[PDB]
Curated annotation (Swiss-Prot), chain C:
Belongs to the RNA polymerase beta chain family. Catalytic core component of RNA polymerase III (Pol III), a DNA-dependent RNA polymerase which synthesizes small non-coding RNAs using the four ribonucleoside triphosphates as substrates. Synthesizes 5S rRNA, snRNAs, tRNAs and miRNAs from at least 500 distinct genomic loci. Pol III-mediated transcription cycle proceeds through transcription initiation, transcription elongation and transcription termination stages. During transcription initiation, Pol III is recruited to DNA promoters type I, II or III with the help of general transcription factors and other specific initiation factors. It is linked to Leukodystrophy, hypomyelinating, 8, with or without oligodontia and/or hypogonadotropic hypogonadism: An autosomal recessive neurodegenerative disorder characterized by early childhood onset of cerebellar ataxia and mild intellectual disabilities associated with diffuse hypomyelination apparent on brain MRI. Variable features include oligodontia and/or hypogonadotropic hypogonadism. DNA template strand binds at residues 4-5, 11. It comes from the Eukaryota. The gene is POLR3B. The chain holds residues 1036 to 1084 of 1133 of the full protein. It is found in: Nucleus; Cytoplasm, Cytosol. Zn(2+) binds at residues 45, 48. This is DNA-directed RNA polymerase III subunit RPC2.
Curated annotation (Swiss-Prot), chain D:
Component of the RNA polymerase III complex consisting of 17 subunits: a ten-subunit horseshoe-shaped catalytic core composed of POLR3A/RPC1, POLR3B/RPC2, POLR1C/RPAC1, POLR1D/RPAC2, POLR3K/RPC10, POLR2E/RPABC1, POLR2F/RPABC2, POLR2H/RPABC3, POLR2K/RPABC4 and POLR2L/RPABC5; a mobile stalk composed of two subunits POLR3H/RPC8 and CRCP/RPC9, protruding from the core and functioning primarily in transcription initiation; and additional subunits homologous to general transcription factors of the RNA polymerase II machinery, POLR3C/RPC3-POLR3F/RPC6-POLR3G/RPC7 heterotrimer required for transcription initiation and POLR3D/RPC4-POLR3E/RPC5 heterodimer involved in both transcription initiation and termination. Belongs to the eukaryotic RPB7/RPC8 RNA polymerase subunit family. GO terms for biological process: defense response to virus; innate immune response; nucleobase-containing compound metabolic process; transcription by RNA polymerase III; transcription initiation at RNA polymerase III promoter. The keyword RNA-binding does not apply. Its main location: nucleus. This is DNA-directed RNA polymerase III subunit RPC8. GO terms for cellular component: centrosome; cytosol; intracellular membrane-bounded organelle; nucleoplasm; RNA polymerase III complex. It comes from Homo sapiens (Human). It is found in: Nucleus. Pfam families: RNA_pol_Rbc25, SHS2_Rpb7-N.
Curated annotation (Swiss-Prot), chain E:
It comes from the Eukaryota. This is DNA-directed RNA polymerase III subunit RPC1. The lineage of its organism: Eukaryota, Metazoa, Chordata, Craniata, Vertebrata. Belongs to the RNA polymerase beta' chain family. Expressed in the brain, in the cortex and the white matter (at protein level). It comes from Homo sapiens.
From Swiss-Prot, chain H:
This is DNA-directed RNA polymerase III subunit RPC9. It comes from Homo sapiens (Human). The gene is CRCP. Ubiquitous. Most prevalent in testis. DNA-dependent RNA polymerase catalyzes the transcription of DNA into RNA using the four ribonucleoside triphosphates as substrates. Specific peripheric component of RNA polymerase III (Pol III) which synthesizes small non-coding RNAs including 5S rRNA, snRNAs, tRNAs and miRNAs from at least 500 distinct genomic loci. With POLR3H/RPC8 forms a mobile stalk that protrudes from Pol III core and functions primarily in transcription initiation. Pol III plays a key role in sensing and limiting infection by intracellular bacteria and DNA viruses. The chain holds residues 1 to 124 of 148 of the full protein. Belongs to the eukaryotic RPC9 RNA polymerase subunit family. One of its GO terms (cellular component) is RNA polymerase III complex.
DNA sequence: TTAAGTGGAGCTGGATGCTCTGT
DNA sequence: TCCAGCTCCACTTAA
RNA sequence: ACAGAG
């Protein structure tokens, strides 16, 4: 996980800074530790360690537990540090299902880590004043009305609660309060009678106290899982067929585990009422689609029943294995070319195969196929079986059956992704640091315009800005921005590859 | 000249066409035949591009970004009150946090 | 060098070394087995070792 | 205007010097290694001020000299920013005015911090100043260099260490300003 | 250890290496200090509250 | 014959000699007779100081071929060695310095 | 109080004479009146018998504490 | 060689005058030997520093003059870096106080500035 | 019935003195 | 030429 | 690589 820890070091430095990435990386690298040795292993002063640990626990990046003799041990949650990279995708997807108020709720929850329901409805109201004009306030009612809709859809969830000291173990205060999760009240909101207005930055006792709320990142992954399945069906069959899949998955949301091979079956009789009214399809034609999907060897859907008419289930695990393979084949095609991608799909279907059959089946000649085969070994896309004749294992007397293993090649390809993003960040930060000369110079000229903008501001200052020697220099700053905007955008787009590969790896593990 | 191993065990039964001798080492960045796929554009994929840059500029200003403390300032002067870096402080909820972490 | 033909010199073996230890002769063992054979200086970087 | 710097060193006293009190021999051998040299982060060492502590004088094997760890303080010309100093002009140059402060000669008055009325010399080494009533742009910083008063706005250290394997630039640099009223030649105020 | 001292060329601890020698120089440790005149604490009570 | 036994724990040393041994009862038990041919080769570096300056001058004058003599001379802060067979030794004796 | 033995050991005697001989070989002051001796080690043996050697032997206990013994106040012996 | 405190104290130029004068009373009783340039470095830095300071108004002062100067200036609300400059340069005009003291036109009243002129020139 | 901890037997890798004196 | 560790395989107890 | 010597 040296690629993960390198990437976690950059993320904590960009969002929290130097004297806390030291403590964060040390916890990821060593595992759980008592507080006294976190300082000693690092050379940080004890006050700075407390400051570093308290911010990492606020944003849910470290856990803590009590152990033998009452010592607190902290433990970093490595995967939750990497999910700081997907934050703009979360803020965009809430803007798709919900209005701009629901966008600003999730933004405050992700940036402050935990908020009380009273605090969030305040800060969303304050920030939405800038989006509006001409006297109209934001009011706290239409904030909460989206929050309670977010809650029912499980995008937002309550944090683990402090226990009631009076009911349980009254007496000497514990070193740490040993928090626990309650399954009843995760999605049960407090009722708030207080209302008000957001302050427009003029610049001239609490009922839900302790009811902290945080973003439920696992609910977003159930959303992004659906979009990967729905879009694959949109390509292969039709948009109409894609909607049938979208209908099944939207119903499945509330009543199935986020990790299970099969969802709850639904009858076609109850799919019919759930599909939107504009789809001018008869019930009989709806059953034509469902059988033609179930006939597909990709097996995104299956039967799994016969009661109440036609019964159909959508396959969650088997869709991911298709998508991980489609991700794996697409990188082969771009790196080595279409004729090599031919050989990758050939060996994957003819599960074990030898060189003379590869050239026969793909119609690719010798000295072109073999060069492609031997590269795919050296980049770990493909494997050798090596069935022996004798316990010598001598090369002259064994048959080298090729094989493609999808799970190992997915773990290998994921490791390339974490280093790829870290490189992209390293390029951006290098070009940002080496241009701090020009960035300060272009700030100070704009600072003359920003400072003393209106009070006493005469017109005799608007020409003296381009009068500095920075006017030829400007060509570099257009090159800076076009570089950064491409590096930032690629840092978003590689996350699409991580989520597809990691969700496949997440589901094959039973963690028994 | 012959080596320690027998060359016939590796191959080369004809007796010629041995591979050549590399004179200069290959370049550090060799030329590649294939190029990256161009990026995805759109009205939605560019809004994520602008939200990503607004999270850096905000979270450096938010009170969670603990900057490193300065030291070894040389002398005191009357320009200390005029140049005091003022910033409000966040306070946690000490019920959830352990007793061992009070400042 | 190895011997009389090459004006070689004489060997302080592993057994003569054991004798000199038993006398506690720490500086003579340093003179014989470092200074009058193969004394040298190396640049060592204290950072990477 | 100077500072003390507290330093430690291991001083080798060779055996012919054993006829002399150790506190005398140590101080001489320390001046020989510190005087008129710039120590990187702290400035130019003038001389040893005192020895504050003096540890045990070991004799290591294979040598006869005595090695003793010395605790001492040294007077170092480190001037703080925005301090006023007086010193004589050694030269006029296109890059600015170069000032001497006795021992120290690397004092820069940059033209971005000179007096505003005259700022570009008309193909002349000597720098100029123009006042409408008196002196028609002929007033000058003379080569004899009568004392100027200047304010030290900036200083910089450049690490003058070997680059590459082995087998002259100024290591301590000081940047002044003269633009404020009351700064200049002493005769002007 | 003895064997690695002979390899590395440093004098062994046992024998004549167990102790250190100090020179009996005519020295005055903790000698009289030069008083400061200016930067003494009684004349420089802090300016700020 | 490897590093650790052959070249590190024990090693060939110079200023060494070897010869046949034969008895001599007229020597004391703490003495050994060394032949002149070994004594002219095996040299000891005597540092020049106030007690031996006038003694070492006579040894420098005799030079390499007479037994109470010297093969090399080396100056105070220099590491090259003047081979004393050449040059005029009565001049090099006068220019002896302490150290 | 000093607990270690008052007798000078043969190893202390060997290294004091050695370090003093090396110091007398360089141009150090001789504390005894020499009488035409040239060999530095012979002069160091006169200084030991006359108790004039300016060396302190720092005996080291294995825990890291130390005792400073003067060469003139140890009991020397053959 | 290692440094345990970079900035430890501020020195007046009187202490350096007293140091190098006490140094001169025992220097040059032995000349330079030219076994090393080390003695040449000590002589040039000691001489040129004192020839500078002997043209500064720090001469004729004494320990009791400097100690009473701080005593008189104690009551005036000045930092160490301002009291030090008033000692080393002997101001006699009003303009350099606006240089040696920051915001002197806001911190000190005009009668307090002219009291500061008299406090310098009557003691020093 | 079999999961498992421990006996007995064969395979493997290590070691075997110190120097000069010559061809 | 002689000798410790490492691994494979039968051989009772125990559920 | 062999022979010597103690
Ligand atoms: Zn290094």
């Amino acid at each position: 996980t040296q690629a993960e820890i390198k990437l976690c070091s950059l993320l904590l430095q960009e969002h929290f800074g130097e004297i806390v990435e030291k403590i964060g990386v040390h916890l990821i690298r060593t595992g759980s530790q008592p507080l006294r040795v976190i300082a000693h292993d690092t050379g940080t002063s004890l006050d700075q360690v407390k400051k570093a640990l308290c911010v990492l626990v606020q944003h849910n990046l470290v856990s803590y537990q009590v152990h033998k003799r009452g010592v607190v041990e902290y433990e970093a949650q490595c995967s939750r540090v990497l999910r700081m990279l997907r934050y703009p995708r979360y803020i965009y997807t809430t803007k798709t299902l919900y209005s701009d108020t629901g966008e600003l709720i999730v933004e405050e929850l992700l940036l402050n880590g935990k908020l009380t329901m009273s605090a969030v409805v305040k800060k969303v109201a304050d920030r939405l004043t800038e989006t509006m004009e001409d006297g109209k306030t934001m009011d706290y009612a239409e904030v909460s009305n989206t929050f309670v809709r977010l809650a029912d859809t499980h995008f937002v969830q309550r944090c683990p609660s402090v226990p009631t000291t009076e009911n349980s173990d009254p007496g000497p205060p514990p070193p740490a309060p040993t928090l626990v999760i309650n399954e009843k009240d995760m999605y049960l909101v407090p009722k708030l009678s207080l209302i008000g207005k957001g302050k427009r930055r003029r610049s001239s006792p609490i009922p839900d106290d302790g009811i902290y709320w945080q973003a439920n990142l696992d609910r977003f992954h159930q959303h992004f899982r659906d979009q990967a399945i729905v879009s694959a069906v949109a390509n292969r069959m039709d948009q109409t067929s894609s909607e049938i899949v979208r209908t099944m998955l939207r119903m499945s949301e509330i009543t199935t585990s986020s990790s299970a091979p099969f969802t709850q079956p639904l009858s076609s009789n109850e799919i019919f009422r759930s599909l939107p009214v504009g789809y001018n399809i008869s019930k009989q034609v709806l059953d034509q689609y469902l059988t033609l999907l179930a006939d597909d060897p990709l097996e995104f859907v299956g039967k799994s029943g016969d009661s109440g008419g036609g019964m159909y289930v959508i396959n969650l695990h088997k869709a991911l294995a298709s998508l991980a393979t489609a991700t794996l084949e697409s990188v082969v095609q771009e790196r080595f070319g279409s004729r090599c991608a031919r050989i990758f799909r050939l060996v994957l279907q003819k599960k074990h195969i030898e060189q003379k059959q590869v050239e026969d089946f793909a119609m690719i000649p010798a000295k072109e196929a073999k060069d492609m085969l031997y590269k795919m070994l050296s980049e770990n896309f493909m494997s050798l079986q090596e069935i022996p004749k004798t316990p010598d294992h001598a090369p002259s007397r064994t048959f080298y059956l090729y094989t493609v293993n999808i799970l190992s090649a997915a773990r290998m390809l994921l490791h390339r992704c974490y280093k790829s993003i870290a490189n992209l960040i390293e390029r951006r930060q290098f070009e940002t640091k080496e241009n701090k000369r020009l960035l300060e110079k272009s700030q100070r000229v704009e600072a003359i315009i920003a400072s003393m903008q209106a009070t006493g501001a005469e017109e005799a200052q608007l020409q003296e800005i381009e009068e500095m020697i920075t006017a030829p220099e400007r060509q570099q700053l257009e090159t800076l921005k076009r570089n950064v905007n491409k590096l930032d955008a690629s840092e978003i787009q590689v996350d699409e590859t991580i989520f597809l590969l990691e969700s496949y790896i997440e589901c094959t593990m039973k963690r028994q | 000249a012959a080596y320690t191993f027998n060359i016939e065990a590796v191959g080369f039964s004809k007796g010629e066409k041995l591979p050549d001798v590399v004179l200069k080492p290959p370049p550090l960045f060799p030329d590649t035949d294939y190029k990256p796929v161009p990026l995805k554009t759109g009205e939605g994929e560019e809004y994520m591009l602008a939200l990503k840059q607004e999270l850096r500029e905000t979270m450096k200003r938010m009170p969670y970004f603990i900057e490193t403390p300065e030291e070894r300032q040389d002398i005191e002067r009357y320009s200390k009150r005029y140049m005091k870096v003022y910033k409000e402080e966040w306070i946690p909820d000490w019920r959830r946090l352990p007793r061992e972490m009070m400042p | 060098t190895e011997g009389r033909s090459r004006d070689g010199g004489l060997r302080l073996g592993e057994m003569e070394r054991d004798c000199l230890i038993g006398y506690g002769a720490s500086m003579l063992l340093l003179e014989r087995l470092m200074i009058s054979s193969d004394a040298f200086e190396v640049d060592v970087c204290g950072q990477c070792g | 205007m100077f500072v003390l710097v507290e330093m430690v060193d291991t001083v080798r006293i060779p055996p012919w010097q054993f006829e002399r009190k150790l506190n005398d021999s140590i101080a001489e051998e320390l001046n020989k290694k510190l005087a008129n040299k710039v120590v990187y982060n702290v400035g130019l060492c003038i001389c040893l001020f005192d020895i504050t502590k003096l540890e045990d004088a070991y004799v290591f094997p294979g040598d006869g000299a005595s090695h003793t760890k010395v605790h001492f303080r040294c007077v170092v010309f480190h001037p703080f920013l925005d301090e006023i100093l007086i010193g004589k002009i050694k030269g006029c140059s296109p890059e600015g005015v170069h000032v001497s402060l006795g021992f120290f000669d690397d004092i820069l008055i940059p033209p971005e911090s000179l007096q505003q009325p005259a700022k570009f010399d008309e193909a002349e080494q000597v720098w100029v100043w123009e006042y409408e009533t008196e002196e028609g742009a002929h007033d000058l910083y003379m080569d004899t260099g009568e004392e100027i008063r200047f304010r030290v706005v900036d200083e910089s250290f450049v690490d003058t260490s070997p680059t590459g394997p082995s087998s002259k630039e100024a290591p301590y640099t000081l940047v002044g300003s003269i633009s404020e009223p009351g700064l200049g030649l002493l005769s002007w105020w | 250890g003895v064997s690695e001292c002979i390899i590395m060329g440093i004098p062994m601890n046992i024998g004549t290496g167990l102790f250190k020698l100090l020179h009996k120089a005519d020295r005055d440790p903790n000698p009289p200090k030069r008083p400061l005149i200016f930067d003494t604490n009684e004349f420089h009570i802090p300016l700020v509250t | 014959q490897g590093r650790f036994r052959g070249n590190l724990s024990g090693k060939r040393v110079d200023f060494s000699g070897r010869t046949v041994i034969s008895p001599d009862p007229n020597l004391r038990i703490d003495e050994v007779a060394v032949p002149v041919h070994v004594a002219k080769i095996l040299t000891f570096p005597e540092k020049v100081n106030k007690a031996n300056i006038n003694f070492l001058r006579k040894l420098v004058q005799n030079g390499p071929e007479v037994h109470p003599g010297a093969n090399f001379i080396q100056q105070r802060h220099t590491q090259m060695k003047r081979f004393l067979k050449y040059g005029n030794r009565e001049k090099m004796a006068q220019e002896l310095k302490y150290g | 109080k000093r607990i270690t033995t008052p007798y000078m050991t043969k190893y202390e005697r060997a290294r004091v004479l050695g370090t003093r001989a090396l110091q007398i070989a360089m141009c150090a002051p001789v504390m005894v009146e020499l009488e035409g001796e040239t060999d530095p080690l012979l002069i160091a043996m006169k200084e030991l018998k006359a108790r004039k050697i300016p060396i302190i032997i720092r005996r080291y206990l294995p825990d890291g504490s130390y005792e400073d013994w003067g060469v003139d106040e140890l009991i020397i012996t053959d | 060689m290692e440094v345990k405190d970079a900035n430890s104290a501020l020195l007046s130029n009187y202490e350096v005058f007293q140091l190098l004068t006490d140094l001169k009373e025992q220097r040059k009783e032995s000349g330079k030997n030219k076994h090393s340039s080390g003695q040449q470095n000590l002589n040039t830095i000691t001489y040129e520093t004192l020839k500078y300071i002997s043209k500064t108004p720090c001469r004729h002062q004494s320990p009791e003059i400097v100690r009473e100067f701080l005593t008189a200036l104690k009551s005036h609300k000045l930092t160490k870096a301002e009291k030090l400059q008033l000692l080393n340069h002997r101001p006699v005009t009003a303009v350099e106080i606006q240089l040696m003291v920051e915001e002197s036109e806001e911190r000190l009243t005009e009668e307090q500035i002219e009291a500061l002129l008299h406090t310098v020139t009557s003691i020093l």
